[PDB]
Amino acid sequence: REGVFVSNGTHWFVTQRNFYEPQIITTDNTFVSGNCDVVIGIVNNTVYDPLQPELDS
């Protein structure tokens, strides 16, 4: 949504652009735009979705 994706070498994070602040990537932090195949340089991952653990109750 705002900021940019990065990896420390083994995990993937989003940070704001002007100050390193690693947030674990979620459906809150990100917006979808279709399937992968159009995007040059995309990478595989897990995006966390906070609703799915809550409705596990």
């Binding site: 735009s33 279709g34 159009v38 995007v39 040059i40 340089g41």
Partner: protein, 50 residues
């Protein structure tokens, strides 16, 4: 200076004109061809037009 991939720089520039950056990544090859072509028009424009 901080290095950044140029397709990742233009995704910042598109946000700075209120266009969501997926409009760049879904069109990157097309945008690149338009920029490359437009610089080609500048070569011809300057080469002819004193």
């Amino acid at each position: 200076a901080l290095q950044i991939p140029f397709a990742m720089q233009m995704a910042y520039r598109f946000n700075g004109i209120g266009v969501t950056q997926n409009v760049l990544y879904e069109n990157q090859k097309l945008i690149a061809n338009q920029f490359n072509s437009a610089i080609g028009k500048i070569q011809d424009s300057l080469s002819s037009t004193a």
